[PDB]
Amino acid sequence: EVNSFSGYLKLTDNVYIKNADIVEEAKKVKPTVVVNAANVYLKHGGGVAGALNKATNNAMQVESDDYIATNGPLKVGGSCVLSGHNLAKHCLHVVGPNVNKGEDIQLLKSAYENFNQHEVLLAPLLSAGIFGADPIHSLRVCVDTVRTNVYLAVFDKNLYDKLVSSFLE
Numbered sequence: 001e002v003n004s005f006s007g008y009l010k011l012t013d014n015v016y017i018k019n020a021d022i023v024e025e026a027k028k029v030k031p032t033v034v035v036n037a038a039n040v041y042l043k044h045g046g047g048v049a050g051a052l053n054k055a056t057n058n059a060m061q062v063e064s065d066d067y068i069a070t071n072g073p074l075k076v077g078g079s080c081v082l083s084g085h086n087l088a089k090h091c092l093h094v095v096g097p098n099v100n101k102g103e104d105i106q107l108l109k110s111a112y113e114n115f116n117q118h119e120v121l122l123a124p125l126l127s128a129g130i131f132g133a134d135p136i137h138s139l140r141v142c143v144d145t146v147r148t149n150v151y152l153a154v155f156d157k158n159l160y161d162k163l164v165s166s167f168l169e
C-alpha cells in the first residue's frame, strides 16, 4: 500500500513526526515523495543525503550528477524533483541553508515552501544536524509553512522528545 505511515504522532492537521531513520521509513512506507536534505551540487557525501544515496546503491548520485551537468546547481532554498529509485516514486532534493557555512536562516522558509508542490511527503528536519540551524526553530518553520501532508522522520530519540515537548508547550 502507498503512503503506509505507522507510529507517527500527529502535531497539526498536516504535520506528523516519528523517531525513525528516514531510510528505514522510505523502505517500510513506500512514499510517493521522499525529501533529501541536499546541497546545491547534489553531492550526497554524508548524513541524510549520503544515507539515502547508499540505500539506492549510488544510483541517486549518478542521476544527480547528470541533472547538474545539464541544469547547473540549485540555489539555497530551492529544489528539484528526480527519481525516488527503490525508496519512493520521486525524490524532492531540497537545499536548506547551512548556517555553519554562513547561509541565511531566513531561507529555511523558502526551503520548506518547496514541500507545498507535493500532496504527501516523507521528510527530514531541514537544516538540522551539521547544517547548524536550531532544530526547534526548524520544526516551527515547517509547521507554519507546509500546508500539504508531511511526515517527519527524526533519527534521534533525545531530539524527538525535545521537539514534541517544545510543540506541546
Ligand SMILES: CC(C)[C@H](Nc1ncnc2[nH]c(Br)cc12)c1ccc2c(c1)S(=O)(=O)CCC2
Residues within 6 Å of the ligand: 020, 021, 022, 023, 037, 046, 047, 048, 049, 051, 124, 125, 126, 127, 128, 129, 130, 131, 153, 154, 155, 156, 159
Ligand atoms: C538531526 C538528525 C538526528 C537528523 N538525522 C537523520 N534524520 C533522519 N533520518 C536519518 N537517517 C540517518 Br543515517 C540520519 C538521519 C538530521 C536532520 C537533518 C539534517 C541532518 C541530520 S545532517 O546532519 O545530515 C545535515 C542535513 C540536515
